[PDB]
């Protein structure tokens, strides 16, 4: 596809991640996890503005990613260094600023 990005959290700078990136894309979410789980785990970092879990309408279940907007770009980064690579339900997830643009 076009979004050929393994999510190095745009550590190499660049990209749309220096504006006000509070939106955190969390990929590799456990295939049976929930928004509330995705949301609570990031609520561990701090205040989560809004957290979504991406699934099919029915069958597809968790499609393996979600988006947790923080109230801060501070706790967003905080989630990337802390929560990115977290064992959620034995699964390892990857959090990064969900590229806004």
Neighbours of 57 (CB within 10 A): 5
To which H or E segment does residue 49 belong? Answer: strand 48-55
Largest CA distance in the chain: 37
Residue 26 buriedness (CB in 10 A; 0-12 / 13-18 / 19+): buried
Comparing CA positions, the residue from 73, 100, 71, 99 lying closest to residue 4 is 99
Tokens of 6: 């393994």
**In CATH, what number is assigned to the domain containing residue 92?**
3.30.70.330
**Pairwise CA distance, residues 4 & 85, whole Å:** 19
59: alpha, beta or left, given left = phi > 0 and alpha = psi -120 to 50?
A: alpha
Residue numbers of the domain that contains 55: 1-101
Neighbours of 5 (CB within 10 A): 13
| Method by which the model was determined | NMR
Number of domains comprising the chain: 1
Q: Are the beta carbons of 32 and 63 closer than 8 angstroms?
A: no
Q: Which residues of 79-99 are buried (b: 16+ CB within 10 A; e: fewer)?
A: bbeebbebebeeeebbbbbbe
Q: Are the beta carbons of 82 and 45 closer than 8 angstroms?
A: yes
């Amino acid at each position: 596809g076009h979004m050929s990005n393994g999510y190095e959290d745009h550590m190499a700078e660049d990209c749309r991640g220096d504006i006000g990136r509070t939106n955190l894309i969390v990929n590799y979410l456990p295939q049976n996890m929930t928004q509330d789980e995705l949301r609570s785990l990031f609520s561990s970092i701090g205040e989560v503005e809004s957290a979504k879990l991406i699934r099919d309408k029915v069958a597809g279940h968790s499609l393996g990613y979600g988006f947790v907007n923080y109230v801060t770009a501070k706790d967003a980064e905080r989630a990337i260094n802390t929560l990115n690579g977290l064992r959620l339900q034995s699964k390892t997830i990857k959090v990064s600023y969900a590229r806004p643009s």
